[PDB]
């Protein structure tokens, strides 16, 4: 029934159990991390075991014959004690009670909460053409044992520790108002005659995998012909911590072969689905995980909370529909000119919503 | 059918024959001046005949300022050494003209400018100036022990041109990006300009690609693209000229929160300019074969001042923006992209000769 | 004997007269620009003449075989009409009398949220391009149709690049010494470094007495004491460029042996004159000009985003101690201070001059 | 005075002589194995004598009795005939000509060459804490006699064979990599201020026994104190054939006595010498020979040649400088992690360069305790 994710320390003294790999941010609040640590009471005798939740922005990558540039900023750190027991985590959950019963009396609960001022899982490995380096926001759940002298020696032995890279996934809020169409229009005067472009989306928020119906209305009062209409989903990424890196990548494209001749108008609805699967080249785009992993998608739209400096988000991700019109010259070779406009939208995961049966699995994510 | 250019001295004692009026500079090397002098053996008896190549910068309309940039002289009569032609053109001319025909070869060095001159307009401060190239054949004689003489009547001068042709190399594809944030606006106006290549030829069309990204709440009302010629006199007087030698005004406007990409084609030509004063030419205004001056090409470790007149070309793109002019700026929204303008690359038996007067055809 | 600065348009239709090249910012308020425009009434018939004050940040430079990157942000724009004619000053009344009835006054004021004249031409070693904050006074004539065609003809316009110079405020409290101390534990024994300046604000050309107190309780020797004035420049608009340059240095030959203490006062004078290489340093004008100095300390006003200053300039005293081993180690510390021009001052005869600033070599 | 290494077969019929125990790999090419076999012509009558060079990766214990206790992958095998003599039979090298003269007319030369795609002598005996078993790359020079029986079965007796475990030792090329450098910075939770660490080595290649000057620049703009600066030489071992075993061990450590207080910077050069002698515990570390032997050192850096699959190297060995900063009021307050950076470098042996007089010795390597 309920799949539980487990990882064990090298020295087999500390084992951590989580209900999920991915924890839901739905704007209003964030799903807290409720898990249990199974200690070997022999191997933790006279020792203290803690669990920490760390959110960190990182920037840099390994390059041969290049100077190693690394940068880390911790955006959140919290730590509770699981052993010896003290009820650090306060009130308990059903998942914990059920796991304690199944695992035995050496099982201790932890609850680490997320605040409201953190970004969601975003990371980016650049392409050859791209100027800056690998960067991302990681979320680490680390259970580790300290000795009674190790607090004075500032030592946390590696073999007694276990770390899990969880994801903070952006879901839509549960109460949302009815959604107005995302629609703009432009009037491109050419020889004092207008070329009018109206672009309309069904709504403002789309879900990963959901088709985006882009309605394009070209009214051509000019003496020129609209030769081509290209519609893109562009992902715009702004690294806002160590280096002001900028990425703009097409994650979906449809190119109609419609012409709009002089003194005529054309309305057309193209459907685009921005998906990581569409992109052979998975570098230079904001993902919510590593390229190698299967459960990795396009990064959701950053949602900056009121009175929160955007820089503490580390990487800003936004999506837009771009419409390019190729317009004929009167007589030339590249006299053909292009006009383009953008319509912003947000992309995220859908809204969120006994005695359990537990199947235990290694936390490690499946590859491709 | 090879056209040969001839000029004859007043006293008919010395006649000079050149293959060309215009000699090719293609950066790597410069085409030397290979010609022949036909003497009247009666009228040069006991006389010596020389041919000189002089490059001089002049400034003024009496005679105001001269700087000699190069001088070389050879002897044609009496004959020097083997006296056999060094080129096919000479061998062929000697055969056609007879045994009173003597070859000369005057070479150009690599540190000289090309034919540039400038006659100013009423609006312009500063005077006429230019770099001239003179081929002069003249006879010397002595009636005294105490002095040799050089009569004007025994001399013949030709004003040849050193014409700039393209090298094998081209510079990287020229590109500019400019952006403006006007007073009280959080939003940029981005202008990107691109040319197909770095070197264009006289008469060749220049495709200027302009990318206006307008994130402002203002409208780009006009996009004007110019070829500007920039002239810097660098010897007697620090005179500066900047003139439009081509202009195209796109019909498209760029409304708020939109972007426009557009390719305008310009051809910088002397023919476009009714007013031919205040611009760097490669010859006199009156002459038909006169064009816009080619881009100066300063060689490494050569002081730019020995070029006399520096000529450069650039594409200027001016954006006219609504509701700033007089309101959020007293200035102009523009960027420049440099390029070089010159003549095409060079192309790398017994001839039939038609002889013509060297004098260039007028308008 | 008041020296007046004049410049005339190409078409000789508009001539502008200013009292100063340099206008004083003393934190509390900024000295406004009071001048006059002399029109040729024949050449401005049916035309309107305006004067604008523009403050702009610029970034970029011309480079052969390199992509031309240019960037401008206007930080302030204001415009008044001088012709046809629409409180005055003594300088204006006096200039009108001397020049005639075709002379019209203008007053353009500065707000409190602008930086002062700062610019920077980089060195070979430096990444990043030329940038600066310029102040333009431009007098120009428009035609009666030119307001509808959005056109300002160049030949009818005249521009002056004035400076906004940072002076200290006129009422200032008594100044606490700028002092910090550090304890560098070495084998659990402290090496204590105290650095102290006489005051917090120094003037360009004023000597800075740096008092350095080394207390060495370690078993190591302080072999060398170097004291620097470092200029720190942060470009904060187009590109996050960073410069740190020594504009003054004194290297004592003092040793502080184990279990001893040494107090020493070095005097440094941060000056552009000390620097042969004048590139990679924040100046208040062009390198070529004579009246150009080191840029004054940026003074960010409360609740003003530092980014609208364009270039941030700060000064600090750096103390480097070379400490022996048994290879040697270097410890260093910084003490911030502010550098600016002194406090301002609690029928005329006019000599007219071209606005163009005097050069060096 | 050239020391020659000799081993003799149990039956005294075949004796092998080598100039060296250790043969030089300097990237560009590898020093070939030039030796001679002395046969007893009575005891090899109607017999053929060969010499083989085998490079093999092994994992587990050495095969006992009949049981296969080892995983074996052969990376190179070559064999030549010494007896009866092949062709001209004259020496190809000065060492051979000289040995033939000194030993007599029953002395026959052999030359076995190394290719460019092999690893160098690497082996590893694990510690109690370590998962995974003993493994290594061995180089065997084996001289052995074959004879034919009355049924058409040829025989290779153990008693007629002699095997020598030579080493392929990594010496430096002509090229060196660029001066290695790292920069790291941290902004801790609730701190607006960076802690900057810059690390620099003098060069990219160091020799065994050569001191490594590690220059560390700590710029501390934080309100916290750097309480400790520890600098390590870490050896990283990756077994890449039978089992994906990973080892990372400190082979040298220096702890600076300086602390870096708030709003200060410290530049400091610590000298480390990564040596097997520093390590009492010699298990869990990549060596170039057996622990018991005296001439055994730390394994040199693996040098993977272009377009050669790294798996045919068997064991990958790399070295790095690690700098750990211990920062006040962090551990269990603003981090459950470590403040550290790594700078890679390569560790190997130095660059290479009448009748001579021979002293003969047993090939067996000298032990310790
Ligand atoms: O800092 P390092 O590189 O020296 O290593 C850590 C620790 O590694 P870790 O941090 O990954 O857990 C070592 O264990 P391992 O890497 O072999 O597992 C431990 O060695 P140990 O107990 O003798 O173990 P064995 O001899 O039985 O192998 C060492 O102790 P010291 O050097 O003697 O103080 C520790 O140093 P510190 O920071 O002072 O606590
Ligand atoms: O360094 P890391 O975080 O990037 O990941 C490394 C490795 O770290 P180390 O070898 O530098 O010590 C991880 O080991 P521990 O952190 O558990 O100690 C290991 O497990 P993991 O973190 O659970 O798995 P992930 O979801 O992170 O992939 C991971 O597994 P593999 O994907 O199957 O190879 C490796 O991936 P890679 O780097 O792509 O080779
Ligand atoms: O001073 P210059 O160089 O400008 O030339 C003068 C004149 O110079 P002089 O004063 O020494 O006599 C030339 O006579 P010569 O001394 O060379 O024999 C003459 O012939 P040219 O050189 O073949 O012809 P171009 O190609 O130079 O025009 C030229 O053309 P004509 O008008 O058709 O007579 C004149 O032009 P200008 O006065 O501008 O009209
Ligand atoms: O294209 P260019 O660069 O050669 O410009 C010409 C002129 O074009 P033209 O040669 O086709 O007639 C421009 O007018 P348009 O192209 O808009 O018609 C005019 O600009 P403007 O102020 O907006 O307009 P006006 O009110 O003065 O007409 C410009 O004046 P400046 O740059 O201010 O000095 C002129 O310069 P110059 O040659 O010195 O007199
Ligand atoms: O944009 P700029 O500040 O670089 O100025 C340009 C030029 O402006 P334009 O070409 O845009 O019209 C100025 O001309 P006008 O103001 O008289 O119209 C000129 O004099 P200037 O600034 O008054 O003189 P000073 O203050 O320096 O004495 C200045 O000469 P330089 O003395 O060598 O600097 C030029 O500099 P450049 O080309 O870099 O050498």
UniProtKB/Swiss-Prot annotation, chain C:
> Where expressed (tissues)?
Detected in retina, in rod photoreceptor cells (at protein level).
Which branch of life, at top level?
A: Eukaryota
Q: Name one GO cellular component term.
A: photoreceptor outer segment
Q: Which SMART domains match?
A: Arrestin_C
- Outcome reported for the amino acid change (mutating residue 284 to R): Strongly increases affinity for RHO by breaking the interaction with R-163. No effect on affinity for RHO
- Stored SUPFAM superfamilies: E set domains (SSF81296)
PTM-bearing positions, type Phosphothreonine: 218
Q: Does the keyword Phosphoprotein apply?
A: yes
**One of the GO BP terms on file:** G protein-coupled receptor internalization
Q: Which InterPro entries match?
A: Arrestin, Arrestin-like_C, Arrestin-like_N, Arrestin_C-like, Arrestin_CS, Arrestin_N, Ig_E-set
Gene Ontology terms for molecular function: G protein-coupled receptor binding; identical protein binding; opsin binding; phosphoprotein binding
Could you list this entry's UniProt keywords, alphabetically sorted: Acetylation, Cell projection, Membrane, Phosphoprotein
Q: What does this protein do?
A: Binds to photoactivated, phosphorylated RHO and terminates RHO signaling via G-proteins by competing with G-proteins for the same binding site on RHO. May play a role in preventing light-dependent degeneration of retinal photoreceptor cells.
Q: How does it assemble?
A: Monomer. Homodimer. Homotetramer. Self-association is cooperative. Isoform A and isoform B interact with RHO (via phosphorylated C-terminus).
Comment field on protein domains: The C-terminus of isoform A interferes with binding to non-phosphorylated RHO. Interaction with phosphorylated RHO triggers displacement of the C-terminus and leads to a conformation change that mediates high-affinity RHO binding. Isoform B is C-terminally truncated and is therefore already in the optimal conformation for RHO binding.
Say which family it is in.
Belongs to the arrestin family.
Name of the protein: S-arrestin
């Amino acid at each position: 029934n309920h799949v539980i994710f487990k990882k064990i320390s090298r020295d087999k003294s500390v084992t951590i159990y989580l209900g999920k790999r991915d924890y839901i941010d739905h704007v209003e609040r964030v799903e807290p991390v409720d898990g249990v640590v199974l200690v070997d009471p022999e191997l933790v005798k006279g020792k203290r075991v803690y669990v920490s939740l760390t959110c960190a922005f990182r920037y840099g990558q390994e390059d041969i014959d290049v100077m190693g540039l690394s940068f880390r900023r911790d955006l959140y750190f919290s730590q509770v004690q699981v052993f010896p027991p003290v009820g650090a985590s306060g009130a308990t959950t059903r998942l914990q009670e059920s796991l304690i019963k199944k695992l035995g009396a050496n099982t201790y609960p932890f609850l680490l909460t997320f605040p409201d001022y953190l970004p969601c899982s975003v990371m980016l490995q650049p392409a050859p053409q791209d100027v800056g380096k690998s960067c991302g926001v990681d979320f680490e759940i680390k259970a580790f044992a300290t000795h009674s002298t190790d607090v004075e020696e500032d030592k946390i032995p590696k073999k007694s520790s276990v770390r899990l890279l969880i994801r903070k996934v952006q879901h839509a809020p549960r109460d949302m108002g009815p959604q107005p169409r995302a629609e703009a229009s432009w009037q491109f005067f050419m020889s004092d005659k207008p070329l009018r472009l109206a672009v309309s989306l069904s709504k403002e928020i789309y879900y990963h995998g959901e088709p985006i119906p882009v309605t394009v209305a070209v009214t051509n009062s000019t003496e020129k012909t609209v030769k081509k209409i290209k519609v893109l989903v562009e992902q715009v990424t702004n690294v806002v911590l160590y280096s002001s890196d900028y990425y703009i990548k097409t994650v979906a494209a449809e190119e109609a072969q419609e012409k709009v001749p002089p003194n005529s108008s054309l309305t057309k609805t193209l459907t685009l689905v921005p998906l990581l699967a569409n992109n052979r080249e998975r570098r230079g785009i904001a993902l919510d995980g590593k390229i190698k992993h299967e459960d990795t998608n396009l990064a959701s739209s950053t949602i900056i909370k009121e009175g929160i400096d955007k820089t503490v988000m580390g990487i800003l991700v936004s999506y837009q529909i771009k419409v390019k019109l190729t317009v004929s010259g009167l007589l030339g070779e590249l006299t053909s000119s292009e006009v383009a406009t953008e319509v912003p939208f947000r992309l995220m995961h859908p809204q969120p919503e006994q005695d359990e049966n537990f199947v235990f699995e290694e936390f490690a994510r499946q590859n491709l």
